[PDB]
Design a protein around this ligand. Structure first.
Ligand SMILES: [Mg+2]
Ligand SMILES: [Mg+2]
Ligand SMILES: [Mg+2]
Ligand SMILES: [Mg+2]
Ligand SMILES: [Mg+2]
Ligand SMILES: [Mg+2]
Ligand SMILES: [Mg+2]
Ligand SMILES: [Mg+2]
Ligand SMILES: [Mg+2]
Ligand SMILES: [Mg+2]
Ligand SMILES: [Mg+2]
Ligand SMILES: [Mg+2]
Ligand SMILES: [Mg+2]
Ligand SMILES: [Mg+2]
Ligand SMILES: [Mg+2]
Ligand SMILES: [Mg+2]
Ligand SMILES: [Mg+2]
Ligand SMILES: [Mg+2]
Ligand SMILES: [Mg+2]
Ligand SMILES: [Mg+2]
Ligand SMILES: [Mg+2]
Ligand SMILES: [Mg+2]
Ligand SMILES: [Mg+2]
Ligand SMILES: [Mg+2]
Ligand SMILES: [Mg+2]
Ligand SMILES: [Mg+2]
Ligand SMILES: [Mg+2]
Ligand SMILES: [Mg+2]
Ligand SMILES: [Mg+2]
Ligand SMILES: [Mg+2]
Ligand SMILES: [Mg+2]
Ligand SMILES: [Mg+2]
Ligand SMILES: [Mg+2]
Ligand SMILES: [Mg+2]
Ligand SMILES: [Mg+2]
Ligand SMILES: [Mg+2]
Ligand SMILES: [Mg+2]
Ligand SMILES: [Mg+2]
Ligand SMILES: [Mg+2]
Ligand SMILES: [Mg+2]
Ligand SMILES: [Mg+2]
Ligand SMILES: [Mg+2]
Ligand SMILES: [Mg+2]
Ligand SMILES: [Mg+2]
Ligand SMILES: [Mg+2]
Ligand SMILES: [Mg+2]
Ligand SMILES: [Mg+2]
Ligand SMILES: [Mg+2]
Ligand SMILES: [Mg+2]
Ligand SMILES: [Mg+2]
Ligand SMILES: [Mg+2]
Ligand SMILES: [Mg+2]
Ligand SMILES: [Mg+2]
Ligand SMILES: [Mg+2]
Ligand SMILES: [Mg+2]
Ligand SMILES: [Mg+2]
Ligand SMILES: [Mg+2]
Ligand SMILES: [Mg+2]
Ligand SMILES: [Mg+2]
Ligand SMILES: [Mg+2]
Ligand SMILES: [Mg+2]
Ligand SMILES: [Mg+2]
Ligand SMILES: [Mg+2]
Ligand SMILES: [Mg+2]
Ligand SMILES: [Mg+2]
Ligand SMILES: [Mg+2]
Ligand SMILES: [Mg+2]
Ligand SMILES: [Mg+2]
Ligand SMILES: [Mg+2]
Ligand SMILES: [Mg+2]
Ligand SMILES: [Mg+2]
Ligand SMILES: [Mg+2]
Ligand SMILES: [Mg+2]
Ligand SMILES: [Mg+2]
Ligand SMILES: [Mg+2]
Ligand SMILES: [Mg+2]
Ligand SMILES: [Mg+2]
Ligand SMILES: [Mg+2]
Ligand SMILES: [Mg+2]
Ligand SMILES: [Mg+2]
Ligand SMILES: [Mg+2]
Ligand SMILES: [Mg+2]
Ligand SMILES: [Mg+2]
Ligand SMILES: [Mg+2]
Ligand SMILES: [Mg+2]
Ligand SMILES: [Mg+2]
Ligand SMILES: [Mg+2]
Ligand SMILES: [Mg+2]
Ligand SMILES: [Mg+2]
Ligand SMILES: [Mg+2]
Ligand SMILES: [Mg+2]
Ligand SMILES: [Mg+2]
Ligand SMILES: [Mg+2]
Ligand SMILES: [Mg+2]
Ligand SMILES: [Mg+2]
Ligand SMILES: [Mg+2]
Ligand SMILES: [Mg+2]
Ligand SMILES: [Mg+2]
Ligand SMILES: [Mg+2]
Ligand SMILES: [Mg+2]
Ligand SMILES: [Mg+2]
Ligand SMILES: [Mg+2]
Ligand SMILES: [Mg+2]
Ligand SMILES: [Mg+2]
Ligand SMILES: [Mg+2]
Ligand SMILES: [Mg+2]
Ligand SMILES: [Mg+2]
Ligand SMILES: [Mg+2]
Ligand SMILES: [Mg+2]
Ligand SMILES: [Mg+2]
Ligand SMILES: [Mg+2]
Ligand SMILES: [Mg+2]
Ligand SMILES: [Mg+2]
Ligand SMILES: [Mg+2]
Ligand SMILES: [Mg+2]
Ligand SMILES: [Mg+2]
Ligand SMILES: [Mg+2]
Ligand SMILES: [Mg+2]
Ligand SMILES: [Mg+2]
Ligand SMILES: [Mg+2]
Ligand SMILES: [Mg+2]
Ligand SMILES: [Mg+2]
Ligand SMILES: [Mg+2]
Ligand SMILES: [Mg+2]
Ligand SMILES: [Mg+2]
Ligand SMILES: [Mg+2]
Ligand SMILES: [Mg+2]
Ligand SMILES: [Mg+2]
Ligand SMILES: [Mg+2]
Ligand SMILES: [Mg+2]
Ligand SMILES: [Mg+2]
Ligand SMILES: [Mg+2]
Ligand SMILES: [Mg+2]
Ligand SMILES: [Mg+2]
Lengths: 60, 253
RNA sequence: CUAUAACGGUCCUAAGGUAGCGAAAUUCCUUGUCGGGUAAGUUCCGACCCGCACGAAAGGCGUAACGAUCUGGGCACUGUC
RNA sequence: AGUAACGCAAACAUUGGUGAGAAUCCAAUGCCCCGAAAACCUAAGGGUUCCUCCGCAAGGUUCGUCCACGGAGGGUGAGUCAGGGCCUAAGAUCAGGCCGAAAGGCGUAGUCGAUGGACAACAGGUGAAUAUUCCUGUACUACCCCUUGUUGGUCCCGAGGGACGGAGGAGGCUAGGUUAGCCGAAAGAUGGUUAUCGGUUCAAGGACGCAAGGUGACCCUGUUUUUCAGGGUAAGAAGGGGUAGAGAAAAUGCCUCGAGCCAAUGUUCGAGUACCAGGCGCUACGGCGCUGAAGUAACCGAUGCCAUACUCCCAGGAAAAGCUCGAACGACCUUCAACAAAAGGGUACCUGUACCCGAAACCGACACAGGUAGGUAGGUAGAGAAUACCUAGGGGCGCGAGACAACUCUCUCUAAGGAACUCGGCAAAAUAGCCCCGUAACUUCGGGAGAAGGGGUGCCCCCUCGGGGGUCGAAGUGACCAGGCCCGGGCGACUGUUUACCAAAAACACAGGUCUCCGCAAAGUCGUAAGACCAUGUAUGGGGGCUGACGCCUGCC
RNA sequence: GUGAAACUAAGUGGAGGUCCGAACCGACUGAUGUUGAAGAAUCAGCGGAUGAGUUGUGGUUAGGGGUGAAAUGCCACUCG
RNA sequence: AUCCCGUGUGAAUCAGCAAGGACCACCUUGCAAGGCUAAAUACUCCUGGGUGACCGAUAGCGAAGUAGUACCGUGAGGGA
């Protein structure tokens, strides 16, 4: 019943950082290649979807 | 007949879950999925604990096989499920061992069974557990024995040699009328978690070797074909030289 | 008696389309011909068979119930006119 | 081109006020809209949008004194709420292990992983912005502390328990609601009238307790078996004890003792000098201080509670920890050390907590006619969470003012005719509830069927517990709501599925049929391999091909 | 009803991929919309609505692939 | 031919063995089946000096100011 463009819905931050998170990119070799080449471009933010385990941004 | 008990320690919840998905997570075995959650009953197929006297307390339904199953007690308080033999009634008594009466539900090595007997739940390998003829209404006759080897006629009609020291159980497997049911509606398939199958002829060429000819397709394939490109009809797949071959005598007809 | 062909001759094939259906979601010529329904019917229903080119699990022929199915007619109803 | 538009057809109006300036900002009085939301709350998300003061460049589809905008300064308080310090599911990682040019792949113990298991708090008050968090009352968990009582406790291990479906209806109850009773106020300029308007509230928790409820075997006699009455049988219920076998607990077998049990709810404490209609006084006229009457009963009645209680069905309905029980084996600790108890005093880990959340703050590039899990469920009419009109609470759609042309769109009606329209009755109109009579061909005997078609219906009295009499209207289920139907044919048996955003079908599925492969280290599929699925299955099962209910059949080569 | 059984009203019972119909899931016709209010909507009607149902949270399968009640459909407005 | 690897076979020790572009004879040259070694050569995320018929804000680095920023994208990434 929802429009095509609605692909990005309200999804728990917990779920997202379990996907694009830091600790995930660290696991695979391809991820470490990721972080090298982000660091090369010198991005202010390495992993965009990340998330505090507990704190002000914490998902329960 | 079917009256639910509380849970004996033989009924657990641990099991494979993705049905038809392998490690890679792919559907290997097509059409499964959906259907009622089940619990695994731990059957005793080996019947290995010898020389104690068991009593059939009840008869229970099992979702994992079309046969019935019987809860039996012992004088030792151990409880086991066995496949329900045909005609066995509650209050009955069974026993396994070597020198034993021959009646329904007793299990013994093939050295001691009088030729002509109707047998089920047949080990092919010493102490591996019973393997052959476990389904509803399945039975195999012990036709002849010679040397170290016994000869059976399996429910497929195939005649085959096995070891004379492999245990088996007297009597046919119960619930004979099961294939007399008529499911009657689609939903009643789905309840068993058997999902709908598409005919080859329907799908597009990419998807299957009988691919869409314009209106309706005769199968132009010079031969009926597996999804994967093999002849569908009458091509024997039995591994040419399997170790088994020396044992097998006449082939199912 | 005009006609038609149960019956014969021959030809060629592995064998020559049986039951049932048939101008059909299949019929080219073709708005075939007949009957019905209409004051008037290239659609519709029934039947003929001359099946260009139906036909038996790429199922054949029936069929109660069912369908935001396709298609013809009728009562009620209306600014559809 | 100073043109189209200014984002619904819920609707605004006036009087004051502030101000340089007011259709738009504040207040008052009307009027209007939502009310299974356009109300209140919570998950996710957002991230400071919350509050106060200041501002009006930009933003705001106009305006602007205003703001979710800009500037400063503030604001989120927990043993009990939610997660973590507890446990595991799907899944993930995986020591060693197996495999692999490398990276890595598979996989065992382990360890992660809630959307589930376990586990303790409520009422009132304060309140620019927080409250089961702060205050005052009563509570409750977990430790520690002392007295007393025992001597072994602790983990590892053995066990019981935790622990589970769908559908159905009948109870027994509350929550709510309505009407009385009690209490207080009432005159609302009209013909009459007090028939009017307000109040009648209280939680967690602790003690008690359970029938007209539900369960507690059989046999004889009756009440319809039932609710019951008399007798009898000897475990015959929750619930306990003993014994036996390699046998502690458990499971299992034999023996014994028990007629009660179960749990919502109820009575009482908590709980009154709480809360509250009014009353008195102040008004910075915003709000404030002061004293407070009655606080019960009946009838409706849940989709909530007992309740995993029943009965039935087949498709047969999570794990682990806390918890209860316990010998041998192993490890460790041991005396004022440890454990066991009823009181008493003490003691109290992190993180979330603002605000929005049927949204102008999330998701749609917008202050966008859209999307977004859950909770709470008032009145009158009604079968109802439909509809209409309302309460509580919230709103009047961030451009207006006129005028009343053509034309377009959303709508109401139309004389006579009644499908003549058109590709086609497309769209409109018609029908409609309830009770009563009646109801065909055909059939797989289930249906068809609400077939078709007809009658009745308001409001008063009277009778029986439907009937008669009266009486208005042109019209009585008078609005909203609420089937057009019949006769044919094709196709497909049927409910289903499908081309997100031009195709919903005759296509796909299907129950059924039939062929063929497959004897378990199965065939088949995926992997370089290891191995995984198949299957913790075993030919009444597993692959694959075609056909497609049921009926009649399925011919030759 | 007969000795067994069949056959038939009755009551009870509450089956169904039953029926009508809100929520909810869809998307059949029409009108509007077409520099939209909206990159698929609104309005009036329409289908399913105890099931082959709907949905939340957390997961799985990945491009010589996956998934598909099969449309070359879908795999972040991209899919021979 | 020389060189180096899968599968299978499988020698000779200096009176030998290998190479001299199939192969054989002769002559010449060399000593496989154990290792290790600097320099001359390649390069610029850079450091220190220097030069420039190099740029001068649409150029020169994407970047003379928050520059891998704002913003966009679930993400890899894009990017003023
Ligand atoms: Mg971003
Ligand atoms: Mg269980
Ligand atoms: Mg248990
Ligand atoms: Mg994986
Ligand atoms: Mg199929
Ligand atoms: Mg196709
Ligand atoms: Mg594909
Ligand atoms: Mg595939
Ligand atoms: Mg091909
Ligand atoms: Mg083909
Ligand atoms: Mg064709
Ligand atoms: Mg004709
Ligand atoms: Mg023609
Ligand atoms: Mg004619
Ligand atoms: Mg016509
Ligand atoms: Mg005809
Ligand atoms: Mg033809
Ligand atoms: Mg032909
Ligand atoms: Mg044909
Ligand atoms: Mg046909
Ligand atoms: Mg054929
Ligand atoms: Mg057919
Ligand atoms: Mg029919
Ligand atoms: Mg349908
Ligand atoms: Mg112009
Ligand atoms: Mg103009
Ligand atoms: Mg204009
Ligand atoms: Mg516009
Ligand atoms: Mg507006
Ligand atoms: Mg209203
Ligand atoms: Mg609001
Ligand atoms: Mg609010
Ligand atoms: Mg939240
Ligand atoms: Mg800000
Ligand atoms: Mg504010
Ligand atoms: Mg301004
Ligand atoms: Mg402005
Ligand atoms: Mg001012
Ligand atoms: Mg501000
Ligand atoms: Mg697991
Ligand atoms: Mg791994
Ligand atoms: Mg390892
Ligand atoms: Mg593991
Ligand atoms: Mg955890
Ligand atoms: Mg939870
Ligand atoms: Mg806790
Ligand atoms: Mg808690
Ligand atoms: Mg607040
Ligand atoms: Mg409070
Ligand atoms: Mg109090
Ligand atoms: Mg305590
Ligand atoms: Mg345990
Ligand atoms: Mg549970
Ligand atoms: Mg009830
Ligand atoms: Mg009450
Ligand atoms: Mg009253
Ligand atoms: Mg009175
Ligand atoms: Mg008056
Ligand atoms: Mg009153
Ligand atoms: Mg109480
Ligand atoms: Mg107490
Ligand atoms: Mg009683
Ligand atoms: Mg014991
Ligand atoms: Mg003992
Ligand atoms: Mg016992
Ligand atoms: Mg009552
Ligand atoms: Mg319900
Ligand atoms: Mg039950
Ligand atoms: Mg010991
Ligand atoms: Mg103890
Ligand atoms: Mg708070
Ligand atoms: Mg709050
Ligand atoms: Mg909205
Ligand atoms: Mg607006
Ligand atoms: Mg909006
Ligand atoms: Mg109501
Ligand atoms: Mg009504
Ligand atoms: Mg009522
Ligand atoms: Mg409503
Ligand atoms: Mg109001
Ligand atoms: Mg006008
Ligand atoms: Mg109207
Ligand atoms: Mg007229
Ligand atoms: Mg008229
Ligand atoms: Mg007329
Ligand atoms: Mg007429
Ligand atoms: Mg006409
Ligand atoms: Mg006509
Ligand atoms: Mg005409
Ligand atoms: Mg119409
Ligand atoms: Mg109409
Ligand atoms: Mg009407
Ligand atoms: Mg009728
Ligand atoms: Mg009919
Ligand atoms: Mg009538
Ligand atoms: Mg009347
Ligand atoms: Mg029809
Ligand atoms: Mg036709
Ligand atoms: Mg169909
Ligand atoms: Mg779908
Ligand atoms: Mg489409
Ligand atoms: Mg359809
Ligand atoms: Mg469509
Ligand atoms: Mg399809
Ligand atoms: Mg089939
Ligand atoms: Mg295999
Ligand atoms: Mg077919
Ligand atoms: Mg239904
Ligand atoms: Mg229907
Ligand atoms: Mg769809
Ligand atoms: Mg609609
Ligand atoms: Mg509907
Ligand atoms: Mg319906
Ligand atoms: Mg049902
Ligand atoms: Mg969905
Ligand atoms: Mg699908
Ligand atoms: Mg195609
Ligand atoms: Mg993308
Ligand atoms: Mg797409
Ligand atoms: Mg496409
Ligand atoms: Mg050389
Ligand atoms: Mg050379
Ligand atoms: Mg090489
Ligand atoms: Mg060699
Ligand atoms: Mg040598
Ligand atoms: Mg050589
Ligand atoms: Mg040399
Ligand atoms: Mg050497
Ligand atoms: Mg060499
Ligand atoms: Mg060397
Ligand atoms: Mg070297
Ligand atoms: Mg510039
Ligand atoms: Mg530049
Ligand atoms: Mg310049």
């Amino acid at each position: 019943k929802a429009a095509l463009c609605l692909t990005k819905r309200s999804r728990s931050r917990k779920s997202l950082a379990r996907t694009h998170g830091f600790r995930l990119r660290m696991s695979t070799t391809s991820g470490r290649a990721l972080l090298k080449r982000r660091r090369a471009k010198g991005r202010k933010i390495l992993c965009t979807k990340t998330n505090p385990s507990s704190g002000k941004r914490a998902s329960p | 007949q079917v009256k639910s008990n509380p849970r004996n320690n033989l009924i657990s919840g641990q099991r494979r879950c993705g049905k038809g998905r392998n490690a890679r997570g792919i559907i290997t075995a097509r059409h499964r999925g959906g259907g009622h959650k089940r619990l695994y009953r731990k059957i005793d197929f080996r019947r290995n604990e010898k020389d104690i006297y068991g009593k059939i307390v009840t008869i229970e339904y099992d979702p994992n096989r079309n046969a019935y199953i019987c809860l039996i007690h012992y004088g030792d308080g151990e409880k086991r499920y066995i496949l329900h033999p045909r005609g066995a009634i509650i209050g009955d008594t069974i026993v396994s061992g070597t020198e034993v009466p021959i009646k329904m539900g007793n299990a013994l090595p093939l050295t001691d069974m009088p030729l002509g007997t109707a047998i089920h739940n047949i080990e092919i390998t010493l102490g591996r557990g019973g393997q052959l003829a476990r389904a509803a209404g399945a039975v195999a006759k012990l036709i002849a024995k010679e040397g170290k080897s016994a000869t059976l006629k399996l429910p497929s009609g195939e005649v085959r040699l096995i070891s004379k020291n492999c245990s088996a159980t007297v009597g046919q497997v119960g619930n004979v009328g099961v294939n007399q049911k008529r499911l009657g509606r689609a939903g009643s398939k789905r309840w068993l978690g058997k999902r709908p199958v598409v005919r080859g002829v329907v799908m597009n060429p990419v998807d299957h070797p009988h691919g869409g000819g314009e209106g309706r397709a005769p199968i132009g394939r010079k031969s009926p074909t597996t999804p994967w490109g093999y002849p569908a009809l009458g091509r024997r797949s039995r591994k040419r030289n399997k170790y088994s071959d020396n044992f097998i005598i006449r082939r199912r007809s």
